[PDB]
Amino acid sequence: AVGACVLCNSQTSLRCGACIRRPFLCCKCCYDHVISTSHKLVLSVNPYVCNAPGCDVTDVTQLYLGGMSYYCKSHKPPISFPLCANGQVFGLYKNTCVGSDNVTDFNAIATCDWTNAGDYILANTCTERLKLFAAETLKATEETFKLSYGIATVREVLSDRELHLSWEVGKPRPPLNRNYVFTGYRVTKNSKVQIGEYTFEKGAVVYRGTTTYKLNVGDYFVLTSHTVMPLSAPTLVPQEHYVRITGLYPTLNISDEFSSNVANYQKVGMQKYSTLQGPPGTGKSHFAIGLALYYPSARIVYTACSHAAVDALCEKALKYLPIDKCSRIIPAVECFDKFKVNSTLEQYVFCTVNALPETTADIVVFDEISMATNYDLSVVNARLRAKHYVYIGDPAQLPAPRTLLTKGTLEPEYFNSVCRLMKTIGPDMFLGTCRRCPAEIVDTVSALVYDNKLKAHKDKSAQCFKMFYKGVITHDVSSAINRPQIGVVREFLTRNPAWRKAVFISPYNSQNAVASKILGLPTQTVDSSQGSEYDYVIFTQTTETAHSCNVNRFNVAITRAKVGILCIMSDRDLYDKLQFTSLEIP
Amino acid sequence: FSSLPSYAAFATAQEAYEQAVANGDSEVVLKKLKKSLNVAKSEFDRDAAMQRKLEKMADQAMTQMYKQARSEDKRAKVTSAMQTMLFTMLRKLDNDALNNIINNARDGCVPLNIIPLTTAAKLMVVIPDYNTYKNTCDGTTFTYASALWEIQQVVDADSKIVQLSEISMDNSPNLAWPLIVTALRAN
Amino acid sequence: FSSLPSYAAFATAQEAYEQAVANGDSEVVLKKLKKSLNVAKSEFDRDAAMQRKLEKMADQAMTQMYKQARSEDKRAKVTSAMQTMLFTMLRKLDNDALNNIINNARDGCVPLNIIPLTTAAKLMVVIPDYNTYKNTCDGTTFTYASALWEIQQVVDADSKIVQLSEISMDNSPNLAWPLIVTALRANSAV
Amino acid sequence: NKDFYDFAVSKGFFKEGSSVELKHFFFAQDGNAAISDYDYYRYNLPTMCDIRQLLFVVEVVDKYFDCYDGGCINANQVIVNNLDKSAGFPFNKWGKARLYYDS
Amino acid sequence: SKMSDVKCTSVVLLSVLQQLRVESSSKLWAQCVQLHNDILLAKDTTEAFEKMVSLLSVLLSMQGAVDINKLCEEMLDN
RNA sequence: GCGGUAGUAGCAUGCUAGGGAGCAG
RNA sequence: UGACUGCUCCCUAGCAUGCUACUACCG
Ligand SMILES: [Zn+2]
Ligand SMILES: [Zn+2]
Ligand SMILES: [Zn+2]
C-alpha cells in the first residue's frame, strides 16, 4: 500500500488507475498527472467510487468523501467536501508533499506506446531511480506486447522434426527464429500437464528439439509470462576509488602467459568498477582466470546470459585452478551441469542472469551486459554487496533487440547505465587480448568503433574472401530466404576443398532450415553463439534493412575468425576501406 | 473562521453599525442597520459551524485510513516479527541449558530428535569439526544441555563405525567429519 | 435548482424592483417592492423544497429496486447449483442391488441404515492401534457385515501409502497410527 | 500481546508470592480431538422414569411457566440478528443465512 | 515472575513452530502440543524449564527452517 | 400593538438501519 | 471450518419530538 514517489520525495498510498505499472504519484503529483494528460481514475488503500448499490462513476474529479465512504455527482448526497480540490488529491501525506518541476516525465514517456526512441532518449536523460522506473517499464511493455500474439499447438502429430501446426484465432504471429521459446502446457480436461520446451522455425512443420518428445493430441506451446517485480537496489555503484590495497589477500607469483595482466591486476587493486568495450578476444577468455589465480580467496562472481557462454570460461575454470572453488546452479532449460550444482557455498560462483540467490560476495567480475535493460545490472548488484566490480561487456556485444523496432536505431553508447558513461569517462582497464581474433577483422572493426584499443596481433595469409555483389531479396511474414548470395556461397564453397568445415549462421533460422534440406549444414542462430567462436565461417544476411546493416549490431559476429573468414555483405556501407582479396564472380 | 467573504461583510457591517450607534442617532437608522446586519451575521454563523464539522470529519477519515493501512501492513510481517520476539524473550530468560544448546546450534552442533528427559532413551547429535568434539566430548562422557551423557556409538558420513581411540588432533583429518554421536542420559 | 418554473418570474420581479429602487422613486414603490419580493420568495420556497424531497424519494426507490434485482439473480444461481448437485449425486446409486433390496420390501419402505450396509461397493476402516488391527483386518481378505472384502490400499494419518509388510508389532511405533484401510466387495459389487 | 505484558510488569505485577496470576490461556489440540470429544455421548443411557411422579412434577413446572403468552407468528414478524452466520450442511457450500433469507 | 515469562515464551515458541508447517507431521505436532499444554499447567519452575528445553530442541533440529546465527547477530539471542 | 403561518440555522431527546468490539450461559 | 440467546460500549446515516434563534406573510 504505502510505497514511494521520489521525484517529489513523497511517500504515497495513491496510484494512477489507468497506467503502465500502477505508478505511484503523490497528491499534487497525481494532480499534474491527471491534468497534463487524461488519467481520470486513481487507486488508494480503497478505490474511489460511489458506494451506493447500483451506482457507477469512474471519474474522481467529482466524487465526495461522505460518511466514512465516497459518493458522486450524478447520484449526489453532497454533504461533504470534494475529493479533488486545491491543487491536490485527498489522501495520506497530503501535507508532506513537494511536487514536480518537470511536469511531463510520465506525461511524455508513460503516455506513448513504449516503442519510440524518445522513451530511451529520456531514459538516458534521467536519474538513477527515474531510469530504474524506465527500465522496469520497458520490461513491462516487452511482456505486455508479447502477450498479444498466438499460441501454437499440435493437434494431430507426425514424425518428429516434421509435424503439422495450427495456431490461434485472428492474432498475428511474432518473428520466426528460436528467439521465442514455445514452452506451453498440455490440458487433459481442466488441468495443465507436462509438455517440455519447443521452438518453431521451419514449416509440414520442422521443429528443433531442445528435448526429445512424444507429442500427443492438442499439445499447446506458447510463452506464458509473469511480470518482473520492482527491484530494491541500484544498478550501478557510484565511482569511488580505493584509498589503498587494504583488505586484499595478495599473492607472490605474477602471471606471465598473459602479457597485459599485471597493470590491470593493480587496477583491480584500486578500481571499484570495471567495464571495457571489446569483441571476442578481449580478456573475457583468460583475464577472468588471471584474476582468479592472482587473488585466490576473493569472492569473485561470474555470469553470462546463457549457460553456454558461462561454459566458455567454466570449462577450464576448474582446470586452471582447483575444482573446489567454482559453481553455477542449473534450473529445470539449456544449462550445463559441469560445476558443483545445487551448491550455494563456493568461492568463484559462476551465474546466469536468469537465476541466482543472494548470500554474500566481495568482488564482481561479470561478463556481457548486453541483451537486457538495467534489470541485469541491478539484479547482480543486489545479488552481492561487493568491494570490487568488473563489468565485462560491450554496448555492441549482443545489443538487446528492441522488440518490434519502428523508428530507427539509437546510438550504441546509450545502453543501460554504464555504456554511455563508458566512453565519456574512459575505459576502466587497459586491456586488449587478440590471441584468437586476427588483424583482418581488427583493422575494420577498430577503425569503425573500437578505436586503438585492440591490437593487430596476428597476420593473414591472403585467404580472406571478397566478391562484389549487389543481390536480390525475398522476404516472408517473419523471416526471409536468400537466392543470390546463398547461391554465390554455394558455388564459392564448390571451389575450395577445405571450406566445408564452417558454420551457417542466419539472421533468422529459416536460412539454415531451408539449406538443411539439400545440403545439411548445422543450425546456427544470430541470437547468441554463446561462448562458441570458431575460425572458418559462412555468414549470411538475406534481408538487411534496419536490424543488420546499420551499426555494430553484429560487428562482433564479424569477429568470427582466427586465421580466415567469410562475411557476406550485400550493401555498400561497411566496405569503405576494407581490403579483402578482390576476385571475380564464377 | 476569518477567511471567508461572509466574515468580511459581517465585519464591515458590524463596524459601520457600531460607529453609527456610538455617534448617536435616530430609530430608523438603527432599524435599517440591524436589518442589513442580521442577514450577514446569519451568513457568517452558518459557515462558522459547517467548516468545523467538515474539518473534524476529514480528520476522522484520515485517521481511519491510516489505521486500515497500518493493520494491512502489520498482518504481512508476522513470521519475522514472531521470530525476533521469540529470540528476544529467549535472551531475557537467561537459562544455562537453553544458552548452552543455543550456542551449540549456533556453532554447528544441532540435535537430530527430541531431547529426552528420562534416565534412558537415545539422543543423536552432529559434530562437524574437531574443536566441537574437543569442547564437548572428553573421555567417554558427553556434556550437552547442562547434563551428562555416555557415548556408545560414532558414525561418519560414510556410515562406518569409528572407535573413540581413533579421534585425535592429527589423526582426525583423514575422516568424514559430520560424525553422529548416540548417547544415553547418565543418572 | 436554477431553472425552476418560478425562477424566471422571481428573478425578473427582483430585477425590476431593484431597478425601481435604484431609480430613487418614492416610498410607495419601495413598499410595493418589499411586498412583491416577499411573496415571490415565499412562493419560490416550496418550489425549492418539494423538488428536493421528490428527488431523494426517487433515488431511494431506484436503490431498492436494484437490490431486489440482485437478490433475484442470486436466487436463480443458487437454484441452479442445488439442481446440479442433486443430479450429480444421483449417478452413483448402483440401481440393481438397490432395486433388488427395494422389491423385497413388503410395501417399498426400508430403513436408511441398511442401504450402505448391503449395497455399498467400498468400505473404509479406521484403526486406532495394532492390537485392534490384528483383530479386525488381519491378512489380505477379511469378513464384515456377512460379506467378504479384500484390501486395496492402506494409508496413514498423513495420507501416505503404507505396505502391509511393515505393519508389525515391532514396527508399530514408527507409523502415524490412525490408519485407514480401503477394501472392495468381493464377488458382489466391485 | 507483549506491550501490555511489559507495561503490567513495569508496575509491580506478576511478582513471586502474589495473589494474582495468569491461569487462563489458549490451549492447543492435536488432530484426533473432534472425534475424541464426540465420543463423550457414551454417557447417555436409556432411562425409565417414575411416571406417576413425573405427571405431577410437570403440572408444577407448568404452574411455574404461567405468566407469559405465546403462539405462532407469520414469516414477516420474525426477528433475526447477524444474518452473516453459517447455515449448516450442505448449505454452507453456497452462502450464509442471508442468501437463504433473501432468496 | 520467572514462571509467567517461561509460559509466554512457550506460547511464542509454539506459534513459531506452527508457522513452519509442523502440523503436517502428526507425531511431532502431537508431541509439541502435549509439551506446550503441560508447560502452561505447571506449578514449579524446574519441570517447566526441562519441558522448555525439550520443546526448543524441536525447533533447533530443523536445518533450513530459520537462521540461528543471523537471529543471534541482531542484538538478539546469545 | 399581540398572535398565527412558511422556510433557515444551532442544540437536545427517543427509535429504526448499518459497521466495529466486550462479557455471560 | 465459525451454533443458539441475553446484556453493554463506540461510530455513521435517517425519522419523529422538543428548545432557541433569523427573516417573511397574515390578521
Ligand atoms: Zn497514469
Ligand atoms: Zn509525486
Ligand atoms: Zn452515486
CATH number at residue A391: 3.40.50.300
Touch between chain B and chain C: 3 or more Cβ pairs under 8 Å: no
Query: Is the alpha carbon torsion for A167, A168, A170, A174 positive or negative?
Result: negative
Helix, strand, coil % over all residues of chain D, rounded to 5: 45, 0, 55
Coil, helix or strand for B142? Answer: strand
Contacts of E6 (CB under 8 A, 6+ apart): B93, E39, E45, E48, E49, E52
CA/C1' separation D69–F25 (Å): 24
CB E21 within 8 A of CB E63: no
- How many angstroms from the chain centroid is the CA of residue D98? 22
Q: How far is C62 from chain A (nearest CA, A)?
A: 9
* Cell numbers describing residue A222: 506458447
CB neighbour class for E27 (10 Å; exposed up to 12, middle 13-18, buried from 19): middle
**Technique behind this structure?**
cryo-EM
The breaks in chain E (C to N more than 2.5 Å) occur after: none
CB neighbour class for C13 (10 Å; exposed up to 12, middle 13-18, buried from 19): middle
CB A361 within 8 A of CB A303: no
Distance CA C177, CA B51 (A): 71
CB D62 within 8 A of CB E71: no
- H or E element in which residue C24 lies: none
- Report CA-CA distances (Å) from A451 to A39, A415, A434, A445: 48, 19, 14, 8
Q: Specify the residue for cell string 573413540.
A: B164
Domain B82-185 sits in which CATH superfamily?
Nsp8 replicase, head domain (3.30.70.3540)
> ∠ at Cα A120 (A119, A123), nearest 5°?
90
Task: Please tell me if residue C116 touches chain E, with a CB cutoff of 8 Å.
Answer: no
Q: Are strands C122-127 and C179-185 parallel, antiparallel or unpaired?
A: antiparallel
- How many angstroms from the chain centroid is the CA of residue C112? 29
Strands (E), A137-261: 152-154, 186-187, 192-193, 200-202, 206-207, 219-221
* Cell numbers describing residue B171: 589423526
Q: For residue B115, count other CB atoms closer than 10 A to its CB.
A: 23
* Longest CA pairwise span in chain C (Å): 124
CA-based nearest residue to A574, from A430, A483, A441, A405: A441
CATH topology of domain C97-185: Alpha-Beta Plaits (3.30.70)
State yes or no: A97 annotated in a binding site: no
Q: For residue A80, count other CB atoms closer than 10 A to its CB.
A: 19
Which neighbouring-strand residues pair with C127? C179
Distance CA D68, CA A251 (A): 102
Exposure string over A365-394, b if 16+ CB within 10 A, otherwise e = bbbbbbbbbbbbbbbbbebbebebbbbbbb
Contacts of A186 (CB under 8 A, 6+ apart): A192, A193, A194, A195, A216, A218, A219, A220
Q: Is the peptide bond before D90 cis (omega within 30 degrees of 0)?
A: yes
**Is C157 in contact with E24 (Cβ distance < 8 A)?**
no
Coil, helix or strand for C33? Answer: helix
Distance CA C72, CA C78 (A): 10
> ∠ at Cα E75 (E71, E78), nearest 5°?
70
Listed by range, residues with Cβ under 7 angstroms from strand G are A 66-68, 79; B 34-35, 38-39, 42, 60; C 34-35, 38-39, 41-42; D 81-82, 85-86, 88, 92, 97
**Crossing angle of the two packed helices A128-146 and A117-124, in degrees rounded to 10:** 160
State yes or no: A388 annotated in a binding site: no
CA-based nearest residue to B58, from A90, A85, A49, A59: A90
Q: How many helices (H) and strands (E) does chain D have?
A: 4, 0
State the alpha helices, DSSP H only, in A271-339: 287-294, 307-320
* Residue A416 half-sphere exposure toward CB, CA atoms < 13 A: 27
- H or E element in which residue B168 lies: none
> ∠ at Cα A533 (A530, A537), nearest 5°?
120
CA-based nearest residue to B105, from B90, B91, B123, B126: B126
DSSP label of A273: -
State the alpha helices, DSSP H only, in chain B: 5-23, 27-74, 78-93, 96-107, 130-136
CB neighbour class for C158 (10 Å; exposed up to 12, middle 13-18, buried from 19): middle
Touch between chain C and chain D: 3 or more Cβ pairs under 8 Å: yes
> ∠ at Cα A217 (A214, A221), nearest 5°?
75
Which neighbouring-strand residues pair with C185? C149
Q: How far, in Å, from the CA of A98 to the mean position of ligand 2? A: 7
The breaks in chain D (C to N more than 2.5 Å) occur after: none
Which neighbouring-strand residues pair with A16? A42
CB A50 within 8 A of CB A63: yes
